[PDB]
Write a protein that binds this ligand. Structure first.
Ligand code: HEM
Length: 371
């Protein structure tokens, strides 16, 4: 496990904080490699798509996967897909999101004495929301959500592969279904508005990618946000009493959690001079989001003033689902602290297990909660 993906519970490790002190750019192999830790340097790399490519370095096509596209084709695909994420489309989803939150919290609560928050809320909430976002029939949602989790998390590689083929097959069918009948959800919107500008294979790959990312990223984000709130009970009470704190609170949980520890490796397409270093064409750069988002001595503080974090990245690849992610947190967090004023850990903090942020996201495996 490379240094930029090591944690002590939620925190970067002291040896990584020490390397950050030495400078913004290090000769370090995460995957000639560079590890980028400087705030301005990370910004600069991510904004400079023309000199720093997102394509895997080779000496494999991923149709519809925006992260893997460089910005001739990235530009056309992104603007074909962007309308599905607009602020207006998002606000129209709000009612189903509130409904889903309440339903899943009802189910979580209905379980015996202590309950795992990951199993009963943190996975189900975003998984169901991702299905709605994609326009998945209500009756298929439980099935598909299980498949999503299992495809990303199963101890059994056979099972990940099986669940993964199941997802691919389901979204191909959903894609052709929505191509014929462009109704509710991301695929319908994209077909109605840019149907001519996109192939069935791009649309299907994009559907799968977005389904998996929306469910998985937010599951991790939601469970860590709640972990943070229950281990800081004062702040939980602040948010309950000052509900107008939700916006800076959602920024703080994104900043502090740093769910994506590093975006895709960037490949230099030209020689570049940066922070006193000679980057050569073909060098591979890892941007450390833990470096940029976290500082030694930082404490979780929902009243935090300015948010300069890069939890969603930066530049042309800046997380396109951000509006949906922020919306979920804005609904789910006030609902959680409102319904459960005495929410707390049911086990010692040292019992908690964390999935490392390589591959993304960093997550808490299990969150036994009380009251
Ligand atoms: C809080 C949860 C999330 C976090 C922290 C997060 C983080 C990120 C980051 C850091 C990137 C940039 C990757 C890169 O530059 O290589 C990204 C891109 C992307 N994300 Fe998110 N994400 C989250 C949730 C979501 C959701 C809910 C969706 C689906 C609606 C989504 C879909 C995407 C897509 C399609 C891209 C690629 C956009 C592009 O490359 O132009 N993510 N995400």
């Amino acid at each position: 496990l490379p240094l930029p993906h090591q944690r002590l519970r939620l925190d970067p490790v002291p040896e990584f904080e020490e390397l950050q002190k030495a400078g913004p750019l290090h000769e370090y192999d995460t995957e000639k490699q560079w590890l980028v830790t400087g705030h301005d340097e990370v910004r600069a790399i991510l904004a400079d798509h023309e000199r720093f490519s997102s394509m895997r370095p080779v000496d494999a096509l991923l149709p519809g996967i925006l992260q893997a596209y460089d910005p001739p084709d990235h530009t056309r695909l992104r603007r074909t897909v962007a309308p599905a994420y607009s602020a207006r489309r998002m606000e129209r989803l709000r009612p189903r999101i509130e409904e889903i939150v309440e339903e899943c919290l009802d189910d979580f609560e209905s379980v015996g004495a202590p309950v795992d928050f990951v199993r009963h809320a943190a996975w189900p909430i975003p998984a169901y929301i991702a299905c709605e976002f994609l326009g998945v029939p209500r009756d298929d949602q439980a099935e598909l959500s299980r498949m999503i989790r299992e495809s990303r998390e199963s101890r059994l590689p056979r099972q990940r592969t099986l669940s993964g083929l199941g997802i691919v097959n389901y979204t191909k069918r959903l894609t052709s279904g929505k191509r014929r009948d462009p109704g509710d959800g991301m695929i319908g919107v994209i077909v109605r508005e840019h149907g001519a500008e996109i192939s069935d294979e791009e649309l299907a790959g994009l559907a799968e990618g977005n389904l998996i990312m929306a469910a998985e990223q937010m599951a991790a984000q939601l469970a860590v946000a709640v972990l943070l709130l229950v281990t800081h009970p004062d702040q939980m009470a602040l948010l309950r009493e000052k509900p107008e704190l939700i916006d800076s609170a959602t920024e703080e949980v994104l900043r502090h959690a740093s769910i994506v520890e590093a975006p895709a490796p960037r490949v230099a397409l030209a020689d570049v001079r940066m922070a006193g270093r000679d980057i050569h064409a073909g060098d591979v750069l890892t941007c450390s989001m833990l470096a940029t988002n976290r500082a030694p001595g930082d404490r979780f503080d929902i009243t935090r003033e300015k948010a300069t974090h890069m939890a969603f990245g930066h530049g042309i690849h800046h997380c396109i689902g951000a509006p949906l992610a922020r919306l979920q947190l804005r609904v789910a967090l006030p609902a959680v602290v409102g319904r459960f004023p005495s929410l707390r850990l049911a086990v010692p903090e040292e019992d908690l297990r964390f999935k490392p942020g390589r591959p993304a996201p960093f997550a808490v495996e299990e969150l036994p909660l009380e009251w």
